[PDB]
Specification:
Chains A, C: The record marks 68 as: Essential for function. Chains A, C: There is a cross-link at residues 6, 11, 27, 29, 33, 48, 63 (Glycyl lysine isopeptide (Lys-Gly) (interchain with G-Cter in ubiquitin)). Chains A, C: The modification Phosphoserine is found at residue 65. Four copies of one chain form a homotetramer. With 76 residues, the first copy, chain A, is an alpha+beta fold. Chain A has one domain (1-76): Roll (Ubiquitin-like (UB roll)). In chain A, 16% of the residues lie in helices and 30% in strands. The first copy, chain A, contains one helix and five strands, in the order E-E-H-E-E-E. The first copy, chain A, has one helix at 23-34; strands at residues 2-6, 12-16, 41-45, 48-49, 66-71. A five-stranded mixed beta sheet of chain A has the order 2-1-5-3-4, with helices on one face. The longest helix of chain A has 12 residues, at 23-34. Chains in contact: A-B, A-C, A-D, B-C, C-D. Chain A binds chain C through residues 6-11, 13, 31-37, 69, 71, 73, 75-76, and chain C through 6-11, 13, 31-37, 69, 71, 73, 75-76.
Amino acid sequence: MQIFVKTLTGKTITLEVEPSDTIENVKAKIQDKEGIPPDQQRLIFAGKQLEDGRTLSDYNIQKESTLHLVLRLRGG
Amino acid sequence: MQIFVKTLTGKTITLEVEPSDTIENVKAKIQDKEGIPPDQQRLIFAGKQLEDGRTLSDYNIQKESTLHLVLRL
Amino acid sequence: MQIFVKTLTGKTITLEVEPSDTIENVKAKIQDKEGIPPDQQRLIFAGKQLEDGRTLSDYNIQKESTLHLVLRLRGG
Amino acid sequence: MQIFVKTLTGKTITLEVEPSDTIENVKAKIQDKEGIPPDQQRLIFAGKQLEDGRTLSDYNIQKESTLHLVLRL
């Protein structure tokens, strides 16, 4: 399956995933493609901040869906 | 000074605010028009998540700046 | 010419540049490849934080050089 | 509590410090062993630039955390 992850700038990252892939797995793929730590990553879908332990299928994220990458830095 | 906020539905609402207003203060104004409690809200600006304690000016939120309201649960 | 930009994670971004390319031009290429705003980008080379208006040749950045991408968020 | 700092030369030096110490306070200790003034220093940790006002604990700098000292000019 294939989903898209959009960055502030507008860059779109395309990832090959499975409906059962957790958000944790996706953050791992984002660290591979963006060099950003899963702890620093924040994923948004339909205005909801996703939880790492839930799978894409748990959030009804279908083929071609777009997620938004937000940054969460410990203290700044 | 008025700022904008893209809400959960996607509809942009307008908020009145001062350069000096903790994000917590802003979330409270968003609870008035939206119903969602501050601790249950998450504000984003310039691609990052804003802390409840920091002030609107600490992030350099200007004139007609637009924020994104997401649901953290 | 070709230089490398390393991220915290260890990801390496490869960019085609010219010795006369400013740091500003490189940050532009990083926004293209990483979706991160030049204002949020901080470039390091040899332990020195580079200035956007200077060219690579001004910092003796040769072929294959490695720069480190650091983040600078306004207030956090 | 002791923290590490990769200096300009690349040599890692060791600093004694408290969970509560503004970054400014840390830069001062780095000026002692390095010679570079605080305003002329730039500290990085977990890929980001740390602010002079924020405290070492606000960034969750623990046990044997390692920072990078760069020259901002």
